[PDB]
Amino acid sequence: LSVDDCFGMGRSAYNEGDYYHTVLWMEQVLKQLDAGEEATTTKSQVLDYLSYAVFQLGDLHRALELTRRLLSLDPSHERAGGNLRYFEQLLEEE
Amino acid sequence: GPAGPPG
């Protein structure tokens, strides 16, 4: 499986509401991107799926860390800014 | 909740 094929696997998982498997696939993609492998998939795309999926597993702190990374690499990302605000709000409540 | 990717 190429990086892009792993991405398509994770996207397929996500589209079915299987967030646990989305995380596994997207962590594999992100590992390969961060190791410098070439693909058409971008780190921003992977982080967008990965952050949301992690939050669905119940992990706010990790979802926030991933969203901050996403925003660092993609400041005009529509949803990442709104998500960051939402997650930061949840963090103040705990 | 957060907004995730469309598709």
Residue numbers in the entry:
A (entry chain A): 145 to 238
B (entry chain C): 3 to 9
Give sentences copied directly from the paper behind this entry.
There are three isoforms of the α‐subunit, complexed with a β‐subunit that is protein disulfide isomerase, forming C‐P4H I‐III.
In addition, it is shown here by crystallographic binding studies that the POG‐PAG‐POG peptide (with 4‐hydroxyprolines at Y‐positions 2 and 8) also adopts the PxGP mode of binding to PSB‐I as well as to PSB‐II. Calorimetric binding studies show that the affinities of these peptides are lower for PSB‐I than for PSB‐II, with, respectively, K D values of about 70 μM for PSB‐I and 20 μM for PSB‐II.
